Design a binder for this molecule. Structure first.
Ligand SMILES: CCCCC/C=C/C/C=C\C/C=C/C/C=C/CCCC(=O)O[C@@H](COC(=O)CCCCCCCCCCCCCCCCC)COP(=O)(O)O[C@@H]1[C@H](O)[C@H](O)[C@H](OP(=O)(O)O)[C@@H](OP(=O)(O)O)[C@H]1O
Ligand SMILES: CCCCC/C=C/C/C=C\C/C=C/C/C=C/CCCC(=O)O[C@@H](COC(=O)CCCCCCCCCCCCCCCCC)COP(=O)(O)O[C@@H]1[C@H](O)[C@H](O)[C@H](OP(=O)(O)O)[C@@H](OP(=O)(O)O)[C@H]1O
Ligand SMILES: CS(=O)(=O)Nc1ccc(C(=O)NCc2ccc(Cl)cc2Cl)cc1
Ligand SMILES: CS(=O)(=O)Nc1ccc(C(=O)NCc2ccc(Cl)cc2Cl)cc1
Ligand SMILES: CCCCCCCO[C@@H]1O[C@H](CO)[C@@H](O)[C@H](O)[C@H]1O
Ligand SMILES: CCCCCCCO[C@@H]1O[C@H](CO)[C@@H](O)[C@H](O)[C@H]1O
Ligand SMILES: CCCCCCCO[C@@H]1O[C@H](CO)[C@@H](O)[C@H](O)[C@H]1O
Ligand SMILES: CCCCCCCO[C@@H]1O[C@H](CO)[C@@H](O)[C@H](O)[C@H]1O
Ligand SMILES: CCCCCCCCCCCCCCCC
Ligand SMILES: CCCCCCCCCCCCCCCC
Ligand SMILES: CCCCCCCCCCCCCCCC
Ligand SMILES: CCCCCCCCCCC(=O)O
Ligand SMILES: CCCCCCCCCCC(=O)O
Ligand SMILES: CCCCCCCCCCCC
Ligand SMILES: CCCCCCCCCCCC
Ligand SMILES: CCCCCCCCCCC
Ligand SMILES: CCCCCCCC
Ligand SMILES: CCCCCCCC
Ligand SMILES: CCCCC
Ligand SMILES: [K+]
Ligand SMILES: [K+]
Ligand SMILES: [K+]
Ligand SMILES: [K+]
Ligand SMILES: [K+]
Ligand SMILES: [K+]
Lengths: 276, 281
């Protein structure tokens, strides 16, 4: 039966689907809980500042403010943004798919080029990213040969030390790829420590909201900085790929276990009930 | 020779690196050529419009205008419509919008129109993304397999009816053509048509929207379901479904293009090698 495996397949898809739907619903209610408040407080104090500027500058007629805001809002759909260095940064947001959005094409032909550039660029960057991941793979692999030698000539031995190696990968990786660059970002951009870590995670997972962008204010920057950020992008993307990938394996495991716990729970509940 | 393959490896990485640098430079100069002009023309006519209300209201402190615009622009990120003729509004963080938000996180499309402002919305977003992205990847994998089989069935029937006086490797060419063509109709063209009519976007803006969304670049300059229009609410559901299946399809296509570049790379390596060896007799 070719249909029988395909039924077992669709069974699995359907259950992961519903778990994802469930993940979205829980997420939606937690986000709403956290943000609908601030949205209300930001809306009332925008309405305050509106009236407080009609009166504290009486020269402005109420009708011309509405025209001023239209001109501002219209020009937000535009804003130099497109110098060589910025347009290079733009190209990086395309091929990495971080896609921050602070800058994006407005011209019919900038958009047509972006389509072509992305379709060829994303796969090309993927090869680089793969190569870079392999390099980091070996460098870390050397380092865990040396720490599965020195810590396997004394204390508690095989299979529990798999757990220790992965902890060192997360801890050293978070220092090198999250913490250290967050420290720099805090000092150089003037972001809070939380905003910087948020920035790191939103950028390296490639979510890339664009609410924060390193090198993105009109600050003066030492031009070692952007280069170093580029390098961090290259290596941070590989590291987050690996980590995201690890978490996937953890969910695969935890899924096996929850299936067995439900099965235990059934087997025992049953021969409790049969015994009656 | 564990070091020998690793040396050959680093050699290849270094060359792809430089090709990528080169790809970025060419890209940068083409984008600049295409955008820097309009940006200059838009900046001079913004400075024009500035003067017509800078000096037609001199009693406004005018350094304080710059502070007013900062407050407006800052509050556009939240998404205020600070008008008296439209002072009553919908919320950006109602359940359906905050559900959409969660989708932009786990897919990593991350459009950015909406994004947490609270210290704790940000802390949740970090946790939510680290667990969510891997979870969605399993779904996306499963969905890809489904489409895999459904198309595989369809090419059993079209590699049967095309059994005329045909080989094992040349019919791979026909299958891939039908995959691009049918896929572009179902996952790019058709939804662009709908998007054009429902959102009022140009046909180009819609296709741009499709490609920027399904590659997961997700600039956020365009977002289906993003205006305060009307919307039938068959619509967003259908868009959700298109996201799910469009992401799987673009994954596959992006993956194919990668193979084509792997091919063309073998060939250019041999052409350069020929060109070297012969060197005009
Ligand atoms: C640490 C910070 C604290 C935060 C809280 C932290 C909370 C914990 C962290 C994250 C949330 C949890 C995420 C992981 C999901 C856990 C739920 C259960 C695992 C799962 O997901 O559903 C599984 C098992 O469900 C069940 O029995 C029913 C139970 C479902 C509900 C259980 C509880 C989950 C709901 C509550 C928690 C999650 C909600 C979200 C939490 C929100 C936090 C923000 C089914 O699907 P299945 O794919 O496993 O099916 C097999 C298998 O998989 C095989 O191996 C083959 O293949 P394959 O899948 O390996 O490829 C397949 O195919 P075949 O053999 O049929 O051909 C097939 O046999
Ligand atoms: C309609 C629109 C069309 C517009 C026209 C646009 C037309 C062009 C279209 C798109 C962009 C360019 C396509 C042409 C190919 C470019 C890549 C150059 C080939 C290359 O790489 O060097 C080759 C051999 O070259 C040389 O001797 C040096 C010559 C390099 C410079 C030659 C021209 C390329 C750069 C300039 C022209 C293109 C620039 C981009 C133009 C922008 C257009 C928007 C050896 O390969 P290798 O040692 O580097 O390593 C391989 C390889 O890298 C493989 O392909 C995997 O990666 P990958 O590079 O393909 O991504 C790895 O896989 P693995 O074995 O590691 O697992 C590994 O096998
Ligand atoms: C918005 S802007 O008009 O001010 N222009 C710029 C913004 C950022 C940068 C820059 O290079 N940032 C480092 C960087 C590099 C590559 C990638 Cl993918 C991401 C990042 Cl964060 C340059 C110009
Ligand atoms: C303008 S708004 O920010 O105020 N609110 C909303 C904006 C958009 C949507 C929506 O459902 N779009 C379909 C959709 C679904 C999931 C994903 Cl991942 C991407 C997309 Cl395009 C809903 C609310
Ligand atoms: C609105 C009702 C439409 C019902 C469509 C049929 C639903 O069944 C499922 O359709 C999948 C897609 O082809 C199959 O692959 C699954 O094996 C099958 O269980
Ligand atoms: C590891 C932390 C590294 C942070 C280095 C911080 C140095 O601050 C520098 O202060 C200068 C004022 O004298 C500014 O003009 C420079 O733009 C700025 O870079
Ligand atoms: C004169 C020496 C050749 C210089 C040509 C410039 C390009 O770099 C070389 O391209 C090769 C592909 O053929 C790589 O895979 C090599 O490792 C690398 O050295
Ligand atoms: C199927 C072949 C695809 C195109 C590859 C042609 C290779 O020839 C030339 O190689 C040079 C490198 O030394 C480049 O400088 C030229 O730009 C390039 O045209
Ligand atoms: C409607 C306006 C269309 C503008 C066309 C934009 C296409 C520009 C493509 C530039 C091609 C780069 C050639 C380099 C290939 C080696
Ligand atoms: C020498 C072996 C490879 C070294 C790997 C990089 C280590 C440095 C950590 C990353 C430093 C950049 C962080 C600051 C980015 C703004
Ligand atoms: C009505 C507007 C016409 C523009 C629509 C886009 C057509 C060109 C898209 C690019 C197709 C070539 C893809 C190249 C694959 C590497
Ligand atoms: C890995 C070392 C950095 C490679 C990228 C160099 C480009 C720097 C351009 C900085 C800028 O955006 O002006
Ligand atoms: C991944 C599948 C989730 C689709 C659930 C349908 C919800 C659509 C929301 C419609 C609305 O917010 O008005
Ligand atoms: C100033 C400290 C910021 C706190 C950042 C914590 C991020 C969440 C930790 C849990 C990771 C899954
Ligand atoms: C054959 C079943 C449906 C095929 C895919 C439909 C997705 C396109 C809908 C686009 C909505 C904007
Ligand atoms: C007039 C519309 C023509 C549609 C072309 C769509 C091309 C999609 C390219 C994705 C591989
Ligand atoms: C200031 C409160 C931050 C903690 C929020 C935790 C959400 C799970
Ligand atoms: C297996 C070869 C497929 C042919 C690719 C080119 C079709 C445009
Ligand atoms: C193919 C598994 C997906 C986890 C990110
Ligand atoms: K990706
Ligand atoms: K992405
Ligand atoms: K993105
Ligand atoms: K964005
Ligand atoms: K945006
Ligand atoms: K994005």
């Amino acid at each position: 039966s070719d249909s029988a495996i395909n039924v077992m397949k669709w069974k699995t898809v359907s259950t992961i689907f519903l778990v994802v739907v469930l993940y979205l619903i829980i997420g939606a209610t937690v986000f709403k809980a956290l943000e609908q408040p601030q949205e209300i407080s930001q809306r009332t104090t925008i309405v305050i500042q509106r009236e407080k500027f009609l009166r504290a500058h009486p020269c402005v007629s109420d009708q011309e403010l509405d025209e001023l805001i239209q001109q501002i809002v219209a020009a937000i759909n535009a804003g130099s943004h497109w110098d060589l260095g910025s347009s290079f940064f733009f190209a990086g947001t395309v091929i990495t798919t971080i896609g921050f959005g602070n800058i994006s094409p407005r011209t019919e032909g900038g958009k047509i080029f972006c389509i072509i550039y992305a379709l060829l660029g994303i796969p090309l960057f993927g090869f680089l990213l793969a190569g870079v991941g392999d390099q980091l793979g070996t460098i870390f692999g050397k380092g865990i040969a040396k720490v599965e030698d020195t810590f396997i000539k004394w204390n508690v031995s095989q299979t529990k030390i798999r757990i220790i190696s992965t902890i060192i990968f997360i801890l050293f990786g978070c220092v090198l790829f999250v913490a250290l660059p967050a420290v720099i970002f805090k000092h150089i951009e003037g972001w809070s420590a939380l905003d910087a870590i948020y920035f790191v995670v939103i950028t390296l997972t490639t979510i890339g909201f664009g609410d924060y962008v390193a090198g993105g204010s009109d600050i003066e920057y030492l031009d070692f900085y952007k280069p170093v950020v580029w390098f961090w992008i290259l290596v941070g993307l590989a590291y987050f790929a690996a980590v995201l990938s690890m978490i996937g394996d953890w969910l695969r495991v935890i899924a096996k276990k929850t299936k067995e716990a439900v099965g235990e729970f059934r087997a025992h509940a049953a021969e409790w009930t049969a015994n009656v």
